[PDB]
Design a protein around this ligand. Structure first.
Ligand SMILES: Cc1cc(C)nc(SCC(=O)Nc2ncc(Cc3ccccc3)s2)n1
Ligand SMILES: [Zn+2]
Length: 278
């Protein structure tokens, strides 16, 4: 036996509206922001060291200028997660993204683990100072071409993203240890689960916990070359479901099953109208 009555989006929907599903964790990757016009900086079709950065900041900040999104308009997928929040279902959103769209969509700091950090804030890098600066400040420096320095001590100011050489934020490990004792459903969206330790999260779910992947391609299966993992398609499969396609399409399909399609359309068009109007 198993919590899902069938291993399909329809079975997940039925589970989510049952008394067994109280607490959803979303795991999200670059797949959820590509339809917002932000390309996945790993993807080859699209176009890093901390020690290097601290001595020669100029290239990172040049590259930052080049890749700075033209607008910050979250996706159907982002507002889907806001909808989980409004309906009391969202325990946490673990994101690999640095684009701040989760926050613009109305996820709060408490709801979020920015596993790879974020551009939302920046800090002076001097240990004895660590002055915090907002994105508005950082954006002005990136666009005005001026290499960002601290007003208090003149040290370099670095966006709060995780560079190679740096460890993931402490919050990632401390939330992981608690959240995955509490989870009823993992929603994995727009990630190929290629980056560690983020990808190890799927193995932290309780054995019974259904795991729904919404992604352009099947991901998370065990590597036949090395080796738990996602099992979608064997006779042993009992809880993992793959919905292949664009993340916005998959969340729309799931909202529709849930009876949330009108709420999600209304939320999205309202928030898009607001962002468009400046
Ligand atoms: C608010 C905002 C600003 C910018 C520039 N972008 C974005 S969202 C897009 C983005 O991928 N920008 C990047 N800037 C520098 C990058 C290189 C890199 C360095 C260190 C670690 C990983 C990658 S990747 N949002
Ligand atoms: Zn400083």
């Amino acid at each position: 036996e198993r919590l899902l009555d069938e291993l399909t989006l329809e079975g997940v929907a039925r589970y989510m509206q049952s008394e067994r599903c109280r607490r959803v964790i979303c795991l999200v990757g670059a797949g959820i922001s590509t339809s917002a016009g932000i390309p996945d900086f790993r993807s080859p079709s699209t176009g890093f060291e901390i020690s290097y950065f601290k001595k020669h900041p100029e290239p990172f900040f040049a590259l930052a200028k080049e890749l700075y999104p033209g607008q910050f308009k979250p996706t159907i997928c982002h507002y889907f997660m806001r909808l989980l929040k409004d309906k009391g279902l969202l325990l946490r959103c673990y994101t690999q993204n640095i684009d701040t769209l989760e926050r613009i969509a109305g996820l709060e700091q408490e709801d979020l683990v920015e596993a790879h950090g974020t551009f939302y804030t920046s800090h002076c890098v001097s240990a004895s100072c660590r002055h915090e600066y907002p994105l508005s400040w950082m954006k002005e420096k990136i666009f005005s071409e001026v290499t960002p320095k601290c007003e208090d001590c003149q040290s370099l100011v670095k966006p709060d993203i995780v560079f190679f050489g740096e460890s993931l934020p402490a919050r990632f490990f401390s939330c992981m240890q608690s959240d995955f004792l509490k989870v009823d459903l993992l929603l994995v969206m727009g990630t190929s689960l290629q980056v560690q330790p983020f990808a190890s999260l799927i193995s932290k779910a309780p054995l019974s916990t259904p795991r729904l992947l919404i992604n352009k391609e099947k991901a998370g299966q065990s590597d036949p070359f090395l080796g738990g993992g996602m099992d979608f398609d064997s006779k042993k499969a009992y809880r993992d479901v793959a919905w292949l396609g664009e993340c916005d399409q998959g969340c729309l399909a799931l909202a529709e099953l849930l009876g949330w399609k009108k709420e999600l359309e209304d939320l999205v068009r309202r928030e898009h109208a607001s962002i468009d109007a400046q």
